[PDB]
From a paper:
Here, we report a 3.18-Å resolution crystal structure of a TcdA fragment composed of DRBD and CROPs I–V (residues L843-T2481, referred to as DRBD-5CROPs), which serves as the foundation for us to piece together all the known fragment structures of TcdA into a complete structure of TcdA holotoxin. The crystal structure of DRBD-5CROPs was solved by molecular replacement (see the Materials and Methods section), and a near complete structure including residues 855–2,481 was built except for a small flexible region including residues 1,661–1,667 that had no visible electron density. The structure of DRBD-5CROPs starts with an N-terminal small globular subdomain (SGS, residues 850–1,025) that is part of the DRBD but with a largely unknown function. Notably, a hydrophobic region buried in the SGS (residues 958–1,039) is considered to be the N-terminal portion of the pore-forming region (PFR, residues 958–1,130) on TcdA, and the rest of PFR then extends away from the SGS forming four α-helices (PFR-α1 to α4, residues 1,040–1,130) that stretch across the elongated DRBD. The N-terminus of the CROPs is connected via a hinge region (residues 1,789–1,831) to the proximal tip of the DRBD where the SGS is localized. The CROPs I to IV then forms an arch-like structure pointing to the distal tip of the DRBD, where the first and second SRs and LR4 of CROPs IV interact with the DRBD. The rest of the CROPs IV-V kinks by ∼35° and extends further away from the DRBD. We found that a well-defined β-hairpin in the SGS of DRBD-5CROPs (residues 937–953) directly interacts with PFR-α1 and α2. We envision that the β-hairpin in the SGS in the closed form of TcdA can help to stabilize PFR-α1 and α2 in the DRBD-shielded conformation at neutral pH. Interestingly, we found that three residues in PFR-α4 (D1117, K1118, and T1120) interact with H2234, T2247, and E2259 in the CROPs IV via van del Waals interactions, suggesting that the CROPs can help stabilize the pore-forming region at interface II in the closed conformation.
Author numbering: 857 to 974, 980 to 1660, 1669 to 2481
Write the structure that this text describes.
Amino acid sequence: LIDEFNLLENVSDELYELKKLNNLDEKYLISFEDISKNNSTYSVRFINKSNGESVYVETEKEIFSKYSEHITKEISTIKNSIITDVNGNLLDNIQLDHTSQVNTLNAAFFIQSLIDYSLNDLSTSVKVQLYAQLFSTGLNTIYDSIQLVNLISNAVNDTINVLPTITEGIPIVSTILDGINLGAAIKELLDEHDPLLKKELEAKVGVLAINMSLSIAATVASIVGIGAEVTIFLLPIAGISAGIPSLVNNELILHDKATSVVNYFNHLSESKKYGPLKTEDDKILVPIDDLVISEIDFNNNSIKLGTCNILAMEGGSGHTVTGNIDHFFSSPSISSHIPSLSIYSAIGIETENLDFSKKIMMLPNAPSRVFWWETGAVPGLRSLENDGTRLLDSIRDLYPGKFYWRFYAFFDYAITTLKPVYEDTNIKIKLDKDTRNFIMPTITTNEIRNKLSYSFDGAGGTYSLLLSSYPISTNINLSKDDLWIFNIDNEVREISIENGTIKKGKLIKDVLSKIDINKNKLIIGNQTIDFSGDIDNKDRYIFLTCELDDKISLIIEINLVAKSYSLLLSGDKNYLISNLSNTIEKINTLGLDSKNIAYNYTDESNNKYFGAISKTSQKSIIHYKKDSKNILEFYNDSTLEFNSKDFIAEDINVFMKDDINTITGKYYVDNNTDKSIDFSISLVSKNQVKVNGLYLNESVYSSYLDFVKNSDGHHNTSNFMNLFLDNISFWKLFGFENINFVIDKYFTLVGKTNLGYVEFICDNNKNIDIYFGEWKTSSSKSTIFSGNGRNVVVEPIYNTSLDFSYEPLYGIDRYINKVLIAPDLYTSLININTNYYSNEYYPEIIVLNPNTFHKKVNINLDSSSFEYKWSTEGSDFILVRYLEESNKKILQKIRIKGILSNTQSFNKMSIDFKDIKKLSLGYIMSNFKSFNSENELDRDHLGFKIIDNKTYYYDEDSKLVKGLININNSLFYFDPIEFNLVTGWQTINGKKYYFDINTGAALTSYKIINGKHFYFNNDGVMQLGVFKGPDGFEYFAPANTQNNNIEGQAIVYQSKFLTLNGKKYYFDNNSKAVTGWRIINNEKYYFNPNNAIAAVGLQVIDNNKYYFNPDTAIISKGWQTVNGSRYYFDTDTAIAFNGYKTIDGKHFYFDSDCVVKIGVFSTSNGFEYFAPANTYNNNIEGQAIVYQSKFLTLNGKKYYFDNNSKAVTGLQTIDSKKYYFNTNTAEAATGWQTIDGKKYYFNTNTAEAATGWQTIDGKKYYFNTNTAIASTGYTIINGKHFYFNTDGIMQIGVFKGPNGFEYFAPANTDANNIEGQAILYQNEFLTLNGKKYYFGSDSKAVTGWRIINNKKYYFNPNNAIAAIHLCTINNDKYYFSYDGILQNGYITIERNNFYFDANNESKMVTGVFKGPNGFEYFAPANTHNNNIEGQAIVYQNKFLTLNGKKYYFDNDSKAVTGWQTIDGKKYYFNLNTAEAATGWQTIDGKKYYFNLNTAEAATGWQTIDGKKYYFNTNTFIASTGYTSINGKHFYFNTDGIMQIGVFKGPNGFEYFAPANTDANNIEGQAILYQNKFLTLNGKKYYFGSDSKAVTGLRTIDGKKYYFNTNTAVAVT
């Protein structure tokens, strides 16, 4: 030890110089593990303690690398003695191998000394090195700057025990499981509840401690309570009342037609009536669907609304308002560039002083929004009155001239389309200290959902949140003491939306596979919760919960900061156990990996149940109280293994390591409140319990030591420990007096003295010895480790002398090796107290010579000099006090080591005795008597040694083993006073063993001892009673029983009965007990082949159940009653009847346990009533009795019996009432049955079929008074007509009878009509919840086309129902107003414009027509970009020829009307139909002519089929009469036809001639024609010099003529 004391100062000196030489501060730490050598130069790492940065310094001196392999070799030894740390708690790995024990002690004792200083710089480097190794991956591998600074901080600023011990002083019961020292750790977790401890104990070593804290109890209760409330609701998804946007053309459209839009506003006006929150189910407040709530303030009892606006209007002219119908001249137009209009400001939504008394609330589902809209031409709407139209009006009126939703310009328009544009909404929820339950909405259009955001402000209460299947970003600001519950039922179950309502379904595989847990972010499946606020609170637990069953709830327990989660199940105890197999598999399906589950449940009657379940093997421990008794139930997988109905322990704790259970507590021995033993117990089998530790308080250990000291040398093997448990009556802890208490390796007993405590432990040999012990007197500290022999070492404690006494050694003296007294420099007194004569062994005392000597050294013995005798052994002085005058012989040996080696130290010694003082070693040698210590068997040999023809065994520490001990799985005995191997017969405290006369081993099983027969168990103890050998079962009996036998020898017993204190045996002729079946005195007996005892009570010998009389042990036959159940055993063969059977004229039934049945059961013989006793005649119990033509009510079901006492099945009439008995059970039916199409109802308390009119819990039915059958279809009930649907429900509406549709009207609608009875309704409308009918003369509803008050309608001839909106009836589309009234013209449908020609019964048609924006080409389908049928299409700058007409269309795709010239041609288009004009046309006075094919205005000369006209090139008018063109003159008819002949112009009659008449003239040109006759058309003319025709009387070439002065024609 001084060898290292020099080495340390050697290596810290050089370390000191190496530091100054590279100018290294006291803040730099050498790092011995990483030193490299490369070609004669060592490179040595130094870590800067402050910032964790590294520096490497070169050296030549090899002391550092040399001393590093010294010390790292010893730290490894220590690191292998420790399993891990759980939150800084180091968990020891207990080693029972003696060389492991002795190696880790030396390493521990070494390193623990270097740490323990105040030079310190080399010391704190060793401590840091060790720390970085036990708690981390080794200093040599850490290179993170921060991680190192924190490691090194922890290493210096705390303190680590690394010396072997188990309790380490703590006065508790130690649990060593799988070789790990868990006991101390689990106490702290249960004491102060560290989140970090709890997590690492579960993760690193598999430990689940369970917490019966009444707080946690309450919490789990309130969580499961919340889950039982919130999950039961059938709520709808978001928007089934407001609407769900459609995505047409990449923008979203909430509503698309006028009526729908008006109705959405109608919906919103419910905020007026019901405030922001309707209370559906009297249990939960629900926000008005799509109402934008942007803050909910629970302190203020107030709401904040978000923004919900609609676009503005601007402009317009001539606003008149007549009959609340806005009329215009210039219609306004919507603008997105003017401020938009708040819809809610028109609504008086009261948003303050709200009744937040209900605890469950659905969150808002509406982000803010600005509504874009559109106007359209829709007819009929002028008579519309809703709370919808009333709201829209209010918006109009709140914001005059900026919003008009239904007006008139030159056609009546209206709001047509509602396009929302959503903006991110953040909804703050400001909580109170109260308790609040929140349900997230299921929002289906993604575009809406990703604008919503929840933000909670915690305030100390309990808050739940029901996650939806489709996530919404939520954020929780944590307060200090608030409790957050997340029920994840929808996130962890397959979801389904059936008619838009949310039903939960299957459990979804592997959802909880990954749970990302982070200081401020949890990820459960698809949902992400973000946390802010008090997010470093190490103590908070957040809870995840869900419902696995009707009655079983799962709670996932999450610590955000310790990034860890744990499992826990709550529910009825007896239920969970019955379904433990099944509800575990649900956990695995979730993909939860946790290997242990805690049980924590509180019933309706307020009794707490606690427990823990191993997932992997389904072993469970349950603890609870009942009538103040302590209950413990251990279940193996739903079947009950161990059950203690009164556990007599205080301070109970329960925990699980992997699948091992441990229960610890205090037990008061003999119920003395002053005698507390502390226990650690693992339940294993029904009648077997494992003890893995006992801590004895001061009183019990002293009683225990007494028991050890009177062990008779039976103080060593594990079975010795069983005999202690016996002596202290420990079975009383449980109640069962024969429990197998299992004492096995790693068992610890640790008792407490008034000076310290000793720790004992079990070997790999199943032997018990001192492991560690320590006690302190006022002045001197006595220590003992199994790893250094089992020597007691006496050292001084500070706060000058060394006291020693034999008294602390009382009882444990057996196990002690030697007492080594070890003085230091500063001890000049060693007091030795020899006058103590109560022990059985007095270990040699060795005074260890201080190697460094001391100024003086003085021993003080309190005995008299004459009792002593000195001796010399080498350089050792010896004193021996021999007390022989008593009856026991005490021999106290004292040896001063090596004091003969130093002639100086030898004369320093003074011993002083009781009667003589200040004596010297010299004096004692010169005057005391001497002796010669020749201890041949105080050798140093390990094993079986053999000395002076006697055999000794030497144990692990090379001591001499004494007593009854296990060696090499064999049992031996060494004399308690002489220690040699004993052979042959030994008594050990009442109980006789026997050890082989050749090998020493105690006898096992059955052997022959010098002519006798002897039976020793596996512990070797001699047994009394009956036991089996290779000749049979003998009776190894007490002494003096049959011819003065010695104990346990098989004796003679033949053909006689033996009853060994409560049993029965029979011995045959050959004196060997009898087994099998055996007939004795003509009477049957069964003796078990395993132990030769007579069976008593019910028994099963080879799948055959017999009853043996409990007193006489003989068979019993016939009827019998055992434990209040009747049985039948065969009168011949005694086998017990099971199944159907017959017995001397009676039917009987017995279920699988051969117990009589009672009731109605089906056999191959019928359905028979196996009846109770004294029911009919004095019938036997269970006898099928005659029950003739009667009804049987079996306190339960109902049966009818026919004449041969058998139950009836099927449909059966009995005494005018109909019944329906089950085919398989024979029992009456109840409720709805359908017996071959026919549907019945059987009254649940009498089973009779219902007859007549009936109200069955919600609706009305009629059951035919003769056949009990439900009514279906049109149906007559005593002359009055009624209607009933497919399931027979009476309907109230309009339905098809054989005489048309009839108003099956409610009660009191015409002259006290009965509800549901058809009535008279003559010449009137009927508007019945949306559907609208008209009833004609006969008060039968009219179908088909029909006009009333000059408004045509159309009632669907399949339901009598008026038509609304666009409709297809007989291949033609019509448009009906909101009230069924047919309309015509320009109607806008879904943002397109169509035409419904009023000249075609208003059929929608394709053509060119006038809409209030122009003439538009209502094209057929697929004419421009896959357009719709009859939709106005774009058609720009093109002509169009259609069905033999011709139009032309301008830039704005609208026809053109009137006089038009289009790219070099003139056209005229009908002011009334935009049709091209074709053919002869008198237009606005002038007469024109347009081409028949191309409708072009004709210009110039044209021949219109038979006649030539000339149309003026300037004005396109057909010219008439004397018309000069191109100089030349022509003459045309009144109707524009060219003429050829003589005609009058301004200058007179000219000749308008054929072509080439004169001077190559063109046809019809007036020509020169001089002094010539011209005779055409029979008429004769003369032309003069002026080429003009002549009138009057004239004289032409001799002849006279008279020419008509009117026509210039010759009339002569």
